[PDB]
Backbone atoms as SQL, in Angstrom:
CREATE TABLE atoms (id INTEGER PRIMARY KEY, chain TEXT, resi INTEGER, resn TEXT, atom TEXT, x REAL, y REAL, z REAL);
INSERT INTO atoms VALUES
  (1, 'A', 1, 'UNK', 'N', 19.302, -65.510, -10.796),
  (2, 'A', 1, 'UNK', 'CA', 20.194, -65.402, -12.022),
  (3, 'A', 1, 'UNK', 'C', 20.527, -63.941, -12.306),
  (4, 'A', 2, 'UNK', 'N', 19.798, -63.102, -12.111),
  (5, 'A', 2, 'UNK', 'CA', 19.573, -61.883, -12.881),
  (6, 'A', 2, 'UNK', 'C', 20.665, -60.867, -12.209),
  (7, 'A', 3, 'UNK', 'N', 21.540, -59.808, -12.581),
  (8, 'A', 3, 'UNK', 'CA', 22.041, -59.087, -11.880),
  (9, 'A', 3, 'UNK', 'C', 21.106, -57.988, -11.413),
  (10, 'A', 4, 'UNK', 'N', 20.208, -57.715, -12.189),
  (11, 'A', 4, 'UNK', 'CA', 18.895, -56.639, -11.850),
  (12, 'A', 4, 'UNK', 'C', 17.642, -56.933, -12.997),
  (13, 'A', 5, 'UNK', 'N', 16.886, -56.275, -12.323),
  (14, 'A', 5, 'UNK', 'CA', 16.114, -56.246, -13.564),
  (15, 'A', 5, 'UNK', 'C', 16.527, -55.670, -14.825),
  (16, 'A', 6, 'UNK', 'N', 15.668, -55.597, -16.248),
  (17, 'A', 6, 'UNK', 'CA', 15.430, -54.509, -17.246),
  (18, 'A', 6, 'UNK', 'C', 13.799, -54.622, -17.854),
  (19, 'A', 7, 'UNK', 'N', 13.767, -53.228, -17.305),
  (20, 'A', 7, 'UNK', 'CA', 12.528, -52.568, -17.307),
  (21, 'A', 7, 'UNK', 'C', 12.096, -51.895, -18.701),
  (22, 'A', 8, 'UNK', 'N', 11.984, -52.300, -20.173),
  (23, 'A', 8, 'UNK', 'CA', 11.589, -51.543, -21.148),
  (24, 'A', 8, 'UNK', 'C', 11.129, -49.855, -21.276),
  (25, 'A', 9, 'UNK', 'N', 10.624, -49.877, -19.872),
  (26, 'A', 9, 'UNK', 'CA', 10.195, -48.454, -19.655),
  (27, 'A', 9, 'UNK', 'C', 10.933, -48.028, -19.197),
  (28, 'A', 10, 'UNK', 'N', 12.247, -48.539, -18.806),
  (29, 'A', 10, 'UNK', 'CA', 13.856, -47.435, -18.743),
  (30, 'A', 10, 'UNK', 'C', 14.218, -47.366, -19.997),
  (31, 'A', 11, 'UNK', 'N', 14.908, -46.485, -20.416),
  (32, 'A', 11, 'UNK', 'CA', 15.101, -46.333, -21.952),
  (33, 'A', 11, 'UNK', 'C', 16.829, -46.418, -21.654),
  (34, 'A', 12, 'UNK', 'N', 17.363, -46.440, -20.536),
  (35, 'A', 12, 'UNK', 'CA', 18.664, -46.662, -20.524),
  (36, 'A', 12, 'UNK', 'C', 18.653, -47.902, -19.565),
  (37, 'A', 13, 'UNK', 'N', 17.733, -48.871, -19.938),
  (38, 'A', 13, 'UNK', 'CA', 18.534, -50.628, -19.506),
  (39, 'A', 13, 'UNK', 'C', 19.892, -51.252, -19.790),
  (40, 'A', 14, 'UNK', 'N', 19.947, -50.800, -21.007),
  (41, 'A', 14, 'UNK', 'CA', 20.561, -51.596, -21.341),
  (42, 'A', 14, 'UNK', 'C', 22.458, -50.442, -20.715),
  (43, 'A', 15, 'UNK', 'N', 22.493, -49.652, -20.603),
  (44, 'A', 15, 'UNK', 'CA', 23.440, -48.885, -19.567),
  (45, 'A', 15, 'UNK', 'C', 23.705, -49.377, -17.851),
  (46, 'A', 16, 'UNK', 'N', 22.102, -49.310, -17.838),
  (47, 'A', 16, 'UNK', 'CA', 22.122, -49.820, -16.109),
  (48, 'A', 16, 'UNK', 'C', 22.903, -51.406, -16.052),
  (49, 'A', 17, 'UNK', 'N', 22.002, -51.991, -16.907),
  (50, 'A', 17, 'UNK', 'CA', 23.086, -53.617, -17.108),
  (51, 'A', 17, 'UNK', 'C', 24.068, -53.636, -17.115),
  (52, 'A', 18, 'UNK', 'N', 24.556, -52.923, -17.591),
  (53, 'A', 18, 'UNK', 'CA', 25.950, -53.042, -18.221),
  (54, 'A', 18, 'UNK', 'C', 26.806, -52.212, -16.725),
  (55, 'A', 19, 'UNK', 'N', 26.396, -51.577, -15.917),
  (56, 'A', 19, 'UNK', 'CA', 26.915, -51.247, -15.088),
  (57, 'A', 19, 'UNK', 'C', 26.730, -51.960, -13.737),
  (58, 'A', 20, 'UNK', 'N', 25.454, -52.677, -13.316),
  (59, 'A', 20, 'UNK', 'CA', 25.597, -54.032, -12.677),
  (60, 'A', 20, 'UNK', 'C', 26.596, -55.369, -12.915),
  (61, 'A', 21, 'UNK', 'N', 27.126, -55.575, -14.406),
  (62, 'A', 21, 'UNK', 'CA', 27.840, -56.402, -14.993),
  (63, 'A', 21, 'UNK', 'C', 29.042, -56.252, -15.006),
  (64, 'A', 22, 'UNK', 'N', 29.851, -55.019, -14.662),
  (65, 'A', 22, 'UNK', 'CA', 30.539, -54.596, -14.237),
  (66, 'A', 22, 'UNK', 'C', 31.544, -53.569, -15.640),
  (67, 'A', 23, 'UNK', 'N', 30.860, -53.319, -16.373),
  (68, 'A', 23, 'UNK', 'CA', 30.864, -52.731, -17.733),
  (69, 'A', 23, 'UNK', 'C', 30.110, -52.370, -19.087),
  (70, 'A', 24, 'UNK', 'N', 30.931, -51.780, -19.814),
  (71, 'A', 24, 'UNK', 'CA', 30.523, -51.618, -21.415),
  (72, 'A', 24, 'UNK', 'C', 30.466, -53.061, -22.085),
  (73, 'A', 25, 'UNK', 'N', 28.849, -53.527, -22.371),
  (74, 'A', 25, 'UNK', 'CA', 29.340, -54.923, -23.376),
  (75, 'A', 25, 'UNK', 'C', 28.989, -55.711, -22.275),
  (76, 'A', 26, 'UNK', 'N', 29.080, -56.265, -21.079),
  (77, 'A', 26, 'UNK', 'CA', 28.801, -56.444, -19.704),
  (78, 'A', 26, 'UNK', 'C', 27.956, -57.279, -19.645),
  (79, 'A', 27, 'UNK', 'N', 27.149, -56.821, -19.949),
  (80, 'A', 27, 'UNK', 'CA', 25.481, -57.385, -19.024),
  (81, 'A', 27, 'UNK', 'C', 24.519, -56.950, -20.745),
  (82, 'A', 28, 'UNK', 'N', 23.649, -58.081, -20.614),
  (83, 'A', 28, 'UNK', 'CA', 22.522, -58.710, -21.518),
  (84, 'A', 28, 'UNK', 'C', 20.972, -58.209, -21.025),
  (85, 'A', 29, 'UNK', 'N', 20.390, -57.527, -21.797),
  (86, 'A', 29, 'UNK', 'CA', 18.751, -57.311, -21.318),
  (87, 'A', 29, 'UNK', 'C', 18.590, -58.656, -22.246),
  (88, 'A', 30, 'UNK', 'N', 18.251, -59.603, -21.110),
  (89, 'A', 30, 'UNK', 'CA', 17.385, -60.474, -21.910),
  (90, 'A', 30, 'UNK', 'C', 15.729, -60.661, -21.135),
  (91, 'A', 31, 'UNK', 'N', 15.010, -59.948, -22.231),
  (92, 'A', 31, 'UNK', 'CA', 13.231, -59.981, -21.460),
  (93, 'A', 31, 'UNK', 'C', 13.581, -59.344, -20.080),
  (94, 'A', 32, 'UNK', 'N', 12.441, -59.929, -19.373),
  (95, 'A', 32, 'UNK', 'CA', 13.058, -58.834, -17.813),
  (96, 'A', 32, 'UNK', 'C', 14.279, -59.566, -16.922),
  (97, 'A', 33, 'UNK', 'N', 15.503, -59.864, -17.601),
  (98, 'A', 33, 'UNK', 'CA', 16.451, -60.238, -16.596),
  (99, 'A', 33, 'UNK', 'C', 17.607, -59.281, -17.139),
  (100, 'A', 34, 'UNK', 'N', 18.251, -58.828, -16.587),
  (101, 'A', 34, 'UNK', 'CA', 19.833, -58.105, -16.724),
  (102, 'A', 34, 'UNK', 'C', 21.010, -59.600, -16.260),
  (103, 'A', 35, 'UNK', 'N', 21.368, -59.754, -17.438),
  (104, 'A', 35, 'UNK', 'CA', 22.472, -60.991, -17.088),
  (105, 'A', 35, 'UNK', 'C', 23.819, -61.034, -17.662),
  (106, 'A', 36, 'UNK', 'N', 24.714, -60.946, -16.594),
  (107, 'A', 36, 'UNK', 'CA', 25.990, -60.606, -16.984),
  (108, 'A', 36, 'UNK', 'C', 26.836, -62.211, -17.980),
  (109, 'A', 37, 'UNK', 'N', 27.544, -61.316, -18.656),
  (110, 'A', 37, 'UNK', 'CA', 28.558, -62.794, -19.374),
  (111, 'A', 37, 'UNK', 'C', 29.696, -62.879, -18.559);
Protein backbone atom coordinates (compact mmCIF):
# COMPACT_ATOMS: atom_id res chain seq x y z
CA UNK A 1 0.00 0.00 0.00
CA UNK A 2 2.46 2.42 1.25
CA UNK A 3 4.38 4.78 -1.13
CA UNK A 4 7.31 4.75 1.58
CA UNK A 5 7.58 4.67 4.86
CA UNK A 6 7.15 7.65 7.68
CA UNK A 7 9.55 7.48 10.21
CA UNK A 8 8.57 9.99 13.28
CA UNK A 9 12.22 10.34 13.76
CA UNK A 10 12.33 12.22 10.33
CA UNK A 11 11.04 15.46 11.28
CA UNK A 12 10.41 16.14 7.54
CA UNK A 13 7.93 12.98 6.76
CA UNK A 14 5.53 14.47 6.12
CA UNK A 15 7.67 16.51 2.95
CA UNK A 16 9.25 13.19 1.94
CA UNK A 17 5.45 11.89 1.47
CA UNK A 18 4.37 14.32 -0.16
CA UNK A 19 7.15 14.03 -2.64
CA UNK A 20 6.72 10.18 -3.18
CA UNK A 21 2.91 11.19 -3.81
CA UNK A 22 3.85 13.19 -6.31
CA UNK A 23 3.29 16.64 -4.40
CA UNK A 24 2.27 19.39 -1.90
CA UNK A 25 -0.98 17.93 -0.04
CA UNK A 26 0.01 14.49 -1.85
CA UNK A 27 0.72 11.86 0.37
CA UNK A 28 -0.71 11.08 4.13
CA UNK A 29 1.69 9.99 7.16
CA UNK A 30 -0.64 7.69 8.39
CA UNK A 31 1.32 5.69 11.52
CA UNK A 32 4.25 4.12 9.62
CA UNK A 33 2.73 4.17 6.07
CA UNK A 34 3.22 7.24 3.55
CA UNK A 35 -0.06 6.95 1.42
CA UNK A 36 -0.84 8.85 -1.46
CA UNK A 37 -4.66 10.19 -2.30
Amino acid sequence: AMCMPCFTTDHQMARKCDDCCGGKGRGKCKGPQCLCR
